[PDB]
Amino acid sequence: VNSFSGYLKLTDNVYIKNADIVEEAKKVKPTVVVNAANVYLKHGGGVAGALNKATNNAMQVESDDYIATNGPLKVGGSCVLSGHNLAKHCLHVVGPNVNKGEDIQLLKSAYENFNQHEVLLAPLLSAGIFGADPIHSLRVCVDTVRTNVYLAVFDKNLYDKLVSSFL
Ligand SMILES: O[C@H]1CCC[C@@H]1Nc1ncnc2[nH]ccc12
Numbered sequence: 001v002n003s004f005s006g007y008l009k010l011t012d013n014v015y016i017k018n019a020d021i022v023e024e025a026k027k028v029k030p031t032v033v034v035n036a037a038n039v040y041l042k043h044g045g046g047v048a049g050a051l052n053k054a055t056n057n058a059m060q061v062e063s064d065d066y067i068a069t070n071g072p073l074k075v076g077g078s079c080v081l082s083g084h085n086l087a088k089h090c091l092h093v094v095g096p097n098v099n100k101g102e103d104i105q106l107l108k109s110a111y112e113n114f115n116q117h118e119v120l121l122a123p124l125l126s127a128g129i130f131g132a133d134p135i136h137s138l139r140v141c142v143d144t145v146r147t148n149v150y151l152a153v154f155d156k157n158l159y160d161k162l163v164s165s166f167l
């Protein structure tokens with residue numbers, strides 16, 4: 001039993017809700033919140049900009065030190081950093097950005113990072129301003145993640161579309 005509330009159950013391990021991931025994180029304080037990161041951990045917009053804003057830019061400060069030490073992530077890769085005031089940990093995961101020409105096949109690799117954590121609050125990778133089809137992202141999530149994932153979908157219209165079209 002966990003404290004996630006109001007989710008629709010899609011499969012044995014995947015749950016979905018129309019919610020602002022920032023407000024959800026502040027309520028649940030999950031062990032792991034997933035960020036929709038880029039390889040530079042430059043948290044400018046979308047989920048990343050919103051999460052970082054909610055940390056008062058502490059996420060960005062921590063991320064800049066991470067990059068200065070380690071260099072950029074790989075597309076499809078991840079790193080674990082602090083969750084600041086939102087969660088114990090933030091798993092920064094880089095899905096391919098279609099608006100940069102990146103290989104959509106890398107979306108499965110991106111979701112594989114979730115399997116290193118027993119429970120996660122997460123967005124749909126590569127959706128939104130990353131330019132992929134969210135229906136496809138949900139399908140890859142369900143077919144790749146085996147741990148317990150609670151998906152927050154900001155856009156109510158998209159949420160309803162994702163539920164109604166889910167196979
Ligand atoms: O699932 C994500 C992945 C792409 C579209 C969805 N959008 C959001 N859902 C919830 N909170 C959010 N805060 C900022 C953006 C956002």
Ligand SMILES: [Cl-]
Pocket residue numbers: 045046047127128129130
């Ligand atoms: Cl977005």
